[PDB]
Amino acid sequence: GTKITFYEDKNFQGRRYDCDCDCADFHTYLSRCNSIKVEGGTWAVYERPNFAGYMYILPQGEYPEYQRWMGLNDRLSSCRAVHLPSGGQYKIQIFEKGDFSGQMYETTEDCPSIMEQFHMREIHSCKVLEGVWIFYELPNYRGRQYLLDKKEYRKPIDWGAASPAVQSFRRIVE
Secondary structure (H helix, E strand, O other), X not given: OOEEEEEEEOOOEEEEEEEOOOEOOOOOOOOOOOEEEEEEOEEEEEEEOOOEEEEEEEOOEEEOOHHHHOOOOOOXXXXXXXXXXXXXOXXXXXXXXXXXXXXXXXEOOOEOOHXXXXXXXXXXXXXXXXXXXXXXXXXXXXXXXXXXXXOEEOOHHHHOOOOXXXXXXXXXXX
């Protein structure tokens, strides 16, 4: 079973909140989060209610400090389980310009440096055809994370980003 437990204090202490399903807002049960136990499944956790603000992907495991999930602050108030479609197939299309224009690349593999492999500094639109992916602001899967589990992303705001700054991406196999 997929469930996740948020703790207000590090090393799994203090006020806690259990969750086995998508939760669009748990700020009335939890005001900070400094440690997490993901008992089952892979989860996207979000700084703000309704899956907004900074987001982080957490596979199963125990996280005693929020930096362990690349947290940027000790605030989380929404979360949702990442459900991988069966078969384990992954395919994405990235575009240099918005609304699916500019040069397009289609790949089924991870990319630790978009500037190196495709000679782009930004991604302005994208189409997720199979599987679930993550965009990262920096190379080698670092910086801000963005979950891509939908199909059409016409602008960077469609994946939660305020800029087209994307520089690596990978599949959620975890």
